[PDB]
């Protein structure tokens, strides 16, 4: 369902692993989902069709 990776603060992207490959998707521009901290964990949720670059911990 959920595919994990790390985000780029400079580019506001999430690079996630799926099917043995890395995929780079823009993070949201929303304040509490964008990449605020370089290399923060991020997730692509394939069920909900959404990205978050401020995943909880
Ligand atoms: Cl790859
Ligand atoms: Cl915007
Ligand atoms: Cl806020």
Short mmCIF file of C-alpha atoms and ligand atoms in Angstrom, two decimals:
data_model
loop_
_atom_site.label_atom_id
_atom_site.label_comp_id
_atom_site.label_asym_id
_atom_site.label_seq_id
_atom_site.Cartn_x
_atom_site.Cartn_y
_atom_site.Cartn_z
CA UNK A 1 0.00 0.00 0.00
CA UNK A 2 2.52 2.49 1.30
CA UNK A 3 5.94 3.10 -0.23
CA UNK A 4 8.67 4.86 1.71
CA UNK A 5 11.53 7.15 0.93
CA UNK A 6 13.27 10.40 1.79
CA UNK A 7 12.52 13.96 0.72
CA UNK A 8 14.60 16.76 -0.77
CA UNK A 9 14.13 20.15 0.85
CA UNK A 10 15.70 21.97 -2.13
CA UNK A 11 13.40 20.35 -4.71
CA UNK A 12 10.37 19.57 -2.52
CA UNK A 13 10.33 15.96 -3.81
CA UNK A 14 9.92 12.48 -2.34
CA UNK A 15 12.04 9.64 -3.73
CA UNK A 16 10.22 6.40 -2.85
CA UNK A 17 10.95 2.68 -3.50
CA UNK A 18 8.34 0.62 -5.42
CA UNK A 19 8.73 -2.51 -7.63
CA UNK A 20 12.48 -2.52 -7.02
CA UNK A 21 12.86 1.00 -8.49
CA UNK A 22 13.11 4.56 -7.16
CA UNK A 23 10.41 7.05 -8.18
CA UNK A 24 10.64 10.86 -7.66
CA UNK A 25 7.22 12.61 -7.09
CA UNK A 26 6.76 16.30 -5.99
CA UNK A 27 5.66 16.63 -2.36
CA UNK A 28 2.54 18.65 -1.69
CA UNK A 29 2.95 22.41 -1.36
CA UNK A 30 0.73 22.28 1.76
CA UNK A 31 2.39 23.67 4.92
CA UNK A 32 2.18 20.46 6.99
CA UNK A 33 2.97 18.00 4.16
CA UNK A 34 5.85 19.69 2.19
CA UNK A 35 9.50 18.72 2.68
CA UNK A 36 10.57 21.07 5.51
CA UNK A 37 13.53 19.01 6.77
CA UNK A 38 16.04 17.66 4.27
CA UNK A 39 16.03 13.83 4.07
CA UNK A 40 12.87 13.53 6.17
CA UNK A 41 10.95 10.29 5.72
CA UNK A 42 8.23 10.52 3.11
CA UNK A 43 5.53 8.14 1.87
CA UNK A 44 3.50 7.53 -1.28
CA UNK A 45 0.21 5.94 -0.27
CA UNK A 46 -1.05 4.05 -3.36
CA UNK A 47 -4.46 3.30 -1.78
CA UNK A 48 -5.25 6.95 -1.02
CA UNK A 49 -3.22 8.25 -4.02
CA UNK A 50 -1.37 10.81 -1.86
CA UNK A 51 2.16 11.90 -0.89
CA UNK A 52 3.31 13.25 2.50
CA UNK A 53 6.82 14.54 3.19
CA UNK A 54 6.10 15.08 6.93
CA UNK A 55 5.23 11.50 7.87
CA UNK A 56 4.52 10.96 11.60
CA UNK A 57 6.96 9.28 13.95
CL1 LIG B 1 15.67 2.65 -10.27
CL1 LIG B 2 0.63 26.05 -4.08
CL1 LIG B 3 0.20 25.31 10.94
#
